Write a protein that holds these residues in place. Structure first.
Motif, PDB file in Angstrom:
ATOM      1  N   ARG A 111      -4.036  33.139  28.625  1.00  0.00           N
ATOM      2  CA  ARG A 111      -2.917  32.391  28.061  1.00  0.00           C
ATOM      3  C   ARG A 111      -2.278  33.169  26.913  1.00  0.00           C
ATOM      4  O   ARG A 111      -1.057  33.323  26.861  1.00  0.00           O
ATOM      5  CB  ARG A 111      -3.372  31.011  27.580  1.00  0.00           C
ATOM      6  N   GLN A 112      -3.102  33.684  26.007  1.00  0.00           N
ATOM      7  CA  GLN A 112      -2.560  34.396  24.857  1.00  0.00           C
ATOM      8  C   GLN A 112      -2.131  35.821  25.242  1.00  0.00           C
ATOM      9  O   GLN A 112      -1.211  36.379  24.638  1.00  0.00           O
ATOM     10  CB  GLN A 112      -3.576  34.416  23.708  1.00  0.00           C
ATOM     11  CG  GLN A 112      -3.025  34.874  22.345  1.00  0.00           C
ATOM     12  CD  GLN A 112      -1.847  34.043  21.831  1.00  0.00           C
ATOM     13  OE1 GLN A 112      -1.788  32.823  22.010  1.00  0.00           O
ATOM     14  NE2 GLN A 112      -0.911  34.712  21.169  1.00  0.00           N
ATOM     15  N   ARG A 115       1.435  35.709  26.320  1.00  0.00           N
ATOM     16  CA  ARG A 115       2.321  35.641  25.166  1.00  0.00           C
ATOM     17  C   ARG A 115       2.528  37.029  24.563  1.00  0.00           C
ATOM     18  O   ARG A 115       3.657  37.399  24.254  1.00  0.00           O
ATOM     19  CB  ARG A 115       1.774  34.665  24.123  1.00  0.00           C
ATOM     20  CG  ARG A 115       1.735  33.242  24.653  1.00  0.00           C
ATOM     21  CD  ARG A 115       1.463  32.203  23.573  1.00  0.00           C
ATOM     22  NE  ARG A 115       2.548  32.180  22.601  1.00  0.00           N
ATOM     23  CZ  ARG A 115       3.653  31.459  22.741  1.00  0.00           C
ATOM     24  NH1 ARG A 115       3.818  30.698  23.813  1.00  0.00           N
ATOM     25  NH2 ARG A 115       4.598  31.506  21.807  1.00  0.00           N
ATOM     26  N   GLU A 116       1.447  37.793  24.419  1.00  0.00           N
ATOM     27  CA  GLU A 116       1.512  39.123  23.808  1.00  0.00           C
ATOM     28  C   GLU A 116       2.306  40.123  24.647  1.00  0.00           C
ATOM     29  O   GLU A 116       3.030  40.963  24.104  1.00  0.00           O
ATOM     30  CB  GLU A 116       0.104  39.671  23.567  1.00  0.00           C
ATOM     31  CG  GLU A 116      -0.652  38.977  22.442  1.00  0.00           C
ATOM     32  CD  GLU A 116      -2.105  39.409  22.362  1.00  0.00           C
ATOM     33  OE1 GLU A 116      -2.541  40.193  23.231  1.00  0.00           O
ATOM     34  OE2 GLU A 116      -2.812  38.964  21.432  1.00  0.00           O
ATOM     35  N   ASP A 118       4.745  39.380  26.823  1.00  0.00           N
ATOM     36  CA  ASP A 118       6.137  38.956  26.675  1.00  0.00           C
ATOM     37  C   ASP A 118       6.699  39.323  25.305  1.00  0.00           C
ATOM     38  O   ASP A 118       7.782  39.899  25.201  1.00  0.00           O
ATOM     39  CB  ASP A 118       6.270  37.443  26.882  1.00  0.00           C
ATOM     40  CG  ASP A 118       6.002  37.019  28.309  1.00  0.00           C
ATOM     41  OD1 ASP A 118       5.807  37.902  29.173  1.00  0.00           O
ATOM     42  OD2 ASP A 118       5.994  35.796  28.566  1.00  0.00           O
ATOM     43  N   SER A 119       5.955  38.974  24.260  1.00  0.00           N
ATOM     44  CA  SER A 119       6.394  39.190  22.885  1.00  0.00           C
ATOM     45  C   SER A 119       6.696  40.658  22.587  1.00  0.00           C
ATOM     46  O   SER A 119       7.792  40.993  22.137  1.00  0.00           O
ATOM     47  CB  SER A 119       5.338  38.674  21.906  1.00  0.00           C
ATOM     48  OG  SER A 119       5.627  39.089  20.585  1.00  0.00           O
TER      49      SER A 119
END
Length: 123
Positions: A111-112, A115-116, A118-119
């Motif tokens: 999940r995280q 995010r990383e 994409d970010s």
């Protein structure tokens, strides 16, 4: 070309992040049930059941060759580890139960990681 080099740096960066992800996921398999490919000497009929075997050692080989172009491809291989196991083995086995725990605990990590990726824009 310079553009090709920049793309190659992005792939190298992605590979660094995925190596971290892979280490965290494998920590959720403390019994090392998924560490190595299923042995065809010890389970001779395995390929009759499972058409695309996968394991952490095999993922690690593909990773170090920078063979994952995006997180989706990495996740596909991780899901194979879990899904193959939950098909071949019954619910009342230490193997199936290990896969369930790996999937549940690994979801948090992935999940995280999404995010990383994409970010920072790694794919």
């Amino acid at each position: 070309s310079m553009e090709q080099v920049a793309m190659e740096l992005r792939l190298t960066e992605l590979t660094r992040l995925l190596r971290s992800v892979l280490d965290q996921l494998q920590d959720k398999d403390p019994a090392r049930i998924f560490a190595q490919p299923v042995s065809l000497k010890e389970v001779p009929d395995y390929l009759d059941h499972i058409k695309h075997p996968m394991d952490f050692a095999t993922m690690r080989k593909r990773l170090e060759a920078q063979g994952y172009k995006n997180l989706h491809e990495f996740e596909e291989d991780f899901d194979l580890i879990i899904d193959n196991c939950m098909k071949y083995n019954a619910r009342d086995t230490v193997f199936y139960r290990a896969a369930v725990r790996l999937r549940d605990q690994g979801g948090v990590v992935l999940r995280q990681a999404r995010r990383e990726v994409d970010s920072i824009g790694l794919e």
